[PDB]
């Protein structure tokens, strides 16, 4: 009882910055890229790893050499061959400073030889420690043991690009008219702020197992709008936010359609550490003391989000030694008194309060959390803090964070791979992902001496120390560990509710009748 049509409409939640995987860093972007392109390895509905462009792979016993065997007859959507040269080209372009990739640092996380030096402009991109041993053998050379390397390769930043096309056309290769990819789908249409339309890529190596023939991604920013369209039956899966007010109702009324995936994600307010006055540790500490997490998780959202005071989710692999900081165990009244003293010491008063804006991406749930935070900060400090809200469109919000044009910004980080360092690495001084501009050489040293570590206990202790240092510096304001609530029509199959990264590959779905 497979449906005859096999069409699906999904809310992607925003207009993506770009379809170039080297120019982007967000979930709307990766969701698109993952339909059009495929890296060495990919995943099933529960996030378990399965062959992608590589049909086979192995590692040396020291976990430093990774050899990928590519498919000898695999073709790009235009019929050009997919070779290890495309991977060499793409990974070089990622770390090349002229690309200005937001995820430039990702191959540094993988410990690829010379990756950090290329990022720092000290070596040329061609000096990166990856190679096409022949057209269908791609080898990756790491300077330290990286036993979790395969899982890293599934990330959008490590997707290959069609070298011959990109070289001919430059950055104009991403135009719908020119876009060539090696994933299960290709672009049929793109209307800015409205819809992206996908069609089968018939040259996909695994096209014979693809079931969905076509799909539409919408760009609905507000969960209530999302939910109304679902109810009208004009889309089949919502994005991963739902209205907290409607939620208990939706669960019972639309029983079996409400999915809630426990995800490897942390929601935070990021403090601009190099802008006055958030360069003052004392002020960063005040904000942390005075913000009640349980108010947001329990009363503003109440969907299963759990309160947290560290960046790494402690339930991630090798995260188990990370401790919640001591102040989180103190009464709020004790916390609030400390915050007021600190703010008074920094020269704030009811007459002259600490004034700043929360920047967030347009989204009613974010607005709700911002209003609560603003509200808690004023009341909890008896008028020493006065907060405004600045909402921006997704692309504009990303540009602002990246450019440092913010005081405090809503921030979500979802694991790029199921191991602690996907969070740990974010806060390195030199990480291209560090929009906080947090910099502590003791943090960097804690993480650096972890890559050397040979067993999981040793790595786990270093990550606990890194967290303790970020904690004492009050680098950001962690709030909660994510849950991913979505509505999914009963006739949509292949969505598990068990993928810790909550990826959606069209090629994993099918419609039943």
């Amino acid at each position: 009882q497979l449906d005859e049509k096999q069409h699906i409409v999904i809310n992607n939640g925003a207009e993506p910055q770009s379809f170039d995987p080297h120019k982007t860093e967000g979930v709307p972007e990766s969701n698109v890229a993952y339909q059009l392109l495929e890296g060495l390895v990919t995943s099933d509905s529960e996030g378990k790893l399965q062959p992608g462009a590589a049909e086979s792979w192995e590692n040396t016993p020291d976990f430093k050499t990774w050899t990928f065997h590519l498919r000898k007859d695999a073709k790009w959507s235009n019929g050009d061959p997919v070779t290890a040269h495309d991977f060499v080209f793409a990974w070089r372009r990622l770390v090349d400073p002229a690309t200005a990739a937001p995820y430039a640092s990702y191959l540094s996380y993988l410990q690829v030889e010379n990756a950090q030096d290329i990022i720092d402009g000290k070596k040329k991109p061609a000096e990166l420690g990856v190679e096409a041993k022949d057209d269908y053998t791609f080898v990756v050379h790491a300077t330290n043991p990286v036993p979790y390397a395969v899982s890293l390769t599934t990330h959008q930043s490590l997707l290959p690009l069609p070298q011959k096309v990109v070289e001919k056309l430059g950055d104009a290769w991403v135009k719908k008219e020119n876009y060539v990819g090696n994933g299960a789908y290709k672009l049929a249409n793109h209307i800015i702020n409205e819809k992206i339309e996908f069609e089968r890529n018939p040259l996909y190596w695994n096209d014979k197992e693809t079931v969905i023939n076509s799909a539409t991604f919408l760009a609905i920013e507000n969960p209530s709008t999302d939910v109304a369209r679902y109810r009208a039956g004009d889309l089949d899966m919502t994005s991963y936010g739902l209205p907290p007010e409607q939620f208990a109702k939706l669960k019972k009324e639309l029983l079996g359609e409400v999915y809630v995936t426990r995800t490897l994600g942390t929601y935070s307010y990021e403090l601009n550490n190099k802008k006055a006055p958030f360069d003052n540790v004392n002020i960063r500490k005040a904000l942390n003391l005075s913000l009640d997490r349980n108010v947001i998780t329990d009363k503003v959202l109440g969907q299963g989000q759990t309160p947290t005071y560290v960046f790494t989710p402690t339930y991630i692999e090798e995260g188990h030694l990370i401790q919640q900081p001591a102040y989180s165990k103190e009464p709020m009244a004790q916390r609030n008194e400390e915050a007021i003293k600190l703010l008074e010491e920094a020269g704030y008063s009811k007459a002259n309060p600490l004034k700043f804006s929360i920047l967030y991406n347009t989204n009613e749930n974010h607005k709700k959390v911002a209003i609560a935070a603003a509200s808690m900060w004023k009341a909890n400090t008896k008028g020493l803090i006065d907060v405004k809200l600045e909402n921006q469109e997704w692309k504009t919000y990303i540009d602002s964070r990246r450019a440092g044009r913010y005081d405090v910004a809503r921030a979500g980080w979802h694991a790029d791979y199921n191991q602690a360092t996907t969070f740990g690495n974010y806060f390195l001084s030199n990480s291209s992902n560090n929009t906080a501009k947090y910099a502590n050489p003791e943090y960097d040293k804690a993480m650096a001496e972890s890559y050397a570590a040979t067993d999981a206990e040793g790595r786990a202790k270093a990550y606990a120390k890194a967290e303790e240092i970020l904690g004492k510096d009050y680098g950001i304001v962690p709030i909660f560990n994510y849950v991913n609530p979505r509505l999914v029509k009963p006739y949509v199959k292949g969505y598990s509710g068990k993928d810790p990264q909550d990826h959606i590959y069209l090629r994993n779905l099918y419609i039943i009748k």
Partner: peptide, 5 residues
């Protein structure tokens, strides 16, 4: 990756 949510 930075989430939309």
């Amino acid at each position: 990756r930075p989430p939309g949510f």
